[PDB]
Amino acid sequence: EWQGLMQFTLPVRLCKEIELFHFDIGPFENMWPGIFVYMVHRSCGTSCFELEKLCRFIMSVKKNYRRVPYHNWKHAVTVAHCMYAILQNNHTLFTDLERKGLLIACLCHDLDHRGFSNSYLQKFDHPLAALYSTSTMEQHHFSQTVSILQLEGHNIFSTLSSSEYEQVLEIIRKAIIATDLALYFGNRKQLEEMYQTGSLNLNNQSHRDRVIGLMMTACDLCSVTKLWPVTKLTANDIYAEFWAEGDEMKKLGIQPIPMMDRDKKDEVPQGQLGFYNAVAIPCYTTLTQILPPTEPLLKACRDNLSQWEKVIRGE
Amino acid sequence: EWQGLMQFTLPVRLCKEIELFHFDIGPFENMWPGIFVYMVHRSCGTSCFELEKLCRFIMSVKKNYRRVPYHNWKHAVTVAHCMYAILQNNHTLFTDLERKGLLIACLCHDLDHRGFSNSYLQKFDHPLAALYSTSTMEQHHFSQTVSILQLEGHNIFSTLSSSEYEQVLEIIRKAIIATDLALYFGNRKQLEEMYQTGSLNLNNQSHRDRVIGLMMTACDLCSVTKLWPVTKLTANDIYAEFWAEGDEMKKLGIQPIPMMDRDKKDEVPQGQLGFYNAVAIPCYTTLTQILPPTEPLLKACRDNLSQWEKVIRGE
Numbered sequence A, B: 001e002w003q004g005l006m007q008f009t010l011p012v013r014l015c016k017e018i019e020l021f022h023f024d025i026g027p028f029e030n031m032w033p034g035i036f037v038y039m040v041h042r043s044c045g046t047s048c049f050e051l052e053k054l055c056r057f058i059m060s061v062k063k064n065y066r067r068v069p070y071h072n073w074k075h076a077v078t079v080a081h082c083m084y085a086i087l088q089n090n091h092t093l094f095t096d097l098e099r100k101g102l103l104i105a106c107l108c109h110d111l112d113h114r115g116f117s118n119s120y121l122q123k124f125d126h127p128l129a130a131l132y133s134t135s136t137m138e139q140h141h142f143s144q145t146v147s148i149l150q151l152e153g154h155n156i157f158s159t160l161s162s163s164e165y166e167q168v169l170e171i172i173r174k175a176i177i178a179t180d181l182a183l184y185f186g187n188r189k190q191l192e193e194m195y196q197t198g199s200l201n202l203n204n205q206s207h208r209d210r211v212i213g214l215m216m217t218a219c220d221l222c223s224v225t226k227l228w229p230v231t232k233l234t235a236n237d238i239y240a241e242f243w244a245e246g247d248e249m250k251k252l253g254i255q256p257i258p259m260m261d262r263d264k265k266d267e268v269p270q271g272q273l274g275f276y277n278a279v280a281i282p283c284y285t286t287l288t289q290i291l292p293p294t295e296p297l298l299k300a301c302r303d304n305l306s307q308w309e310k311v312i313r314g315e
């Protein structure tokens, strides 16, 4: 099976559509592993990784996402695809090493997620929180990536020099860390200012890491940039995960926040509104200012915001 | 009427096209009864049913479909044909008794449909809802089937033992009930787990029952698997019928849901993309896994889904 992935060929029709931001992987489950291979090949080249190792890596990454409602294998590939479209539209802004790292990082950014937030683990003294005090899950995700890399025949970065091996791990590490939404708000705030004053410079490494940060957020949340019926369905998976967590708290005696409370569904429409206004819109707005070809992301997001506004009005 | 049918020979220029999953019966209206005959002869043999009784039965079946926009005689034969194509492409898996039963089941699965859903009937306290509390129309459909079998000169299962007769009515009954879409979701979900755990055993009768059910669902929805110009037009019949149910609710003065509401005509494309994603795609996806030969159904379904995307996007 991990061999059948090597003889995979992407259908011609899909070769055209995969380039667009709005593309939806959802109806093509059996092709997701192959879709990642294709995307890595178009962005980085066909002789970048050894195909054997690359295919073994990908299959092992799929195996280590759980059967949870939202933070699953589908999510990993969804996030990788959006990165791909960002990279493709701003190709020469990034180095070979960065594109390698960011795609792999997107594929790995939620590895071994259990369906629980950083709040939960920390509040209920889960061992993961004892090990990782800030950005709990995200640190575990990066730890999971290294583990897979160190498996027999799984080290896709074996052709690299020591120097480039370290550089790419660090790129991946910051990238995964950056998907902690707790860190997004500060990041986006800084970038907005640097853009306003005209002080943002891509050759400044810390500015560069900030940009990559924002890119990781945009990709993590891109399911709000898909066509309305796709986003609506994803919303169900997201909320199915939140409610499952809130129920765990109710069993433990403690009342969950509204977002995680299956008894507060009425509040959901207004919760989506709040999320779009406070998080998602300002995310893609800042991104479009820095990387103008990412405009379609902001555009789609605005469409979905507009939709939720109709729901609140009574449709 | 039944006598001109005994004389019927399918024209040779359709002897190959008929075997294709995407075959459209639409241009061949007055051949529909003969096409069924033909499909039965090829899949069960010309020795299976007495030709006189079989012809009488088909014509009574035809007359007991009402002149409704979608749940009519055309749909009955369209669904039967898809079953034909499945059975043909999995030559060895199903028993003689199963094949006899499944074709008859498909042709009868919507008998005497009134163009109203179950919830409509239960809502407004229709005598049929008072009779069958769950799967209301489906239990009526089967009832209509048994009535026609028990007409004079119509019992096509005359040449079966008492035991086989009981088995084949059980096969038909379960298959008709399974076309209740409410039960589809549970069934597909179980089947997915069984494939995933590898615990799916076709020696297990209640596993066969589940598989048969999924095939029923697949055939029932197969209008989403035809060539675009055929799928696009059948959609208009489906919604005509949804809207008539809503109109009836609005005559009575009650608000229907958007699917049935014709003041929501514009949202049909979005409504199609949603349905394909939440219902059609997972159906044929799980069917293809269980029965690899049925893959052309999924492929066709994917092609029509992207067509709706283009409609929504103005392409």
Ligand SMILES: O=c1ccn(-c2cccc(C(F)(F)F)c2)nc1-c1ccnn1-c1ccccc1
Pocket: A181, A220, A221, A222, A223, A224, A235, A238, A271, A272, A275, A279
């Ligand atoms: O649709 C949503 C509603 C709420 N949240 C959310 C999540 C966490 C924190 C917060 C908080 F606002 F509380 F900080 C809000 N995320 C999404 C969303 C849309 C796309 N990905 N995700 C997502 C992001 C992260 C986790 C789950 C889902």
Ligand SMILES: O=c1ccn(-c2cccc(C(F)(F)F)c2)nc1-c1ccnn1-c1ccccc1
Pocket: B181, B220, B221, B222, B223, B224, B235, B238, B271, B272, B275
């Ligand atoms: O094109 C469609 C749009 C919506 N529905 C639908 C039907 C029931 C429930 C739901 C619900 F979304 F509520 F679950 C959606 N079915 C079809 C469709 C495509 C092919 N056959 N049928 C079909 C299936 C069943 C009945 C009539 C038509």
Ligand SMILES: [Mg+2]
Pocket: A109, A110, A137, A138, A179, A180
């Ligand atoms: Mg995460």
Ligand SMILES: [Mg+2]
Pocket: B109, B110, B137, B179, B180
């Ligand atoms: Mg029905």
Ligand SMILES: [Zn+2]
Pocket: A075, A079, A109, A110, A179, A220
């Ligand atoms: Zn994520």
Ligand SMILES: [Zn+2]
Pocket: B075, B079, B109, B110, B179, B220
């Ligand atoms: Zn039907």
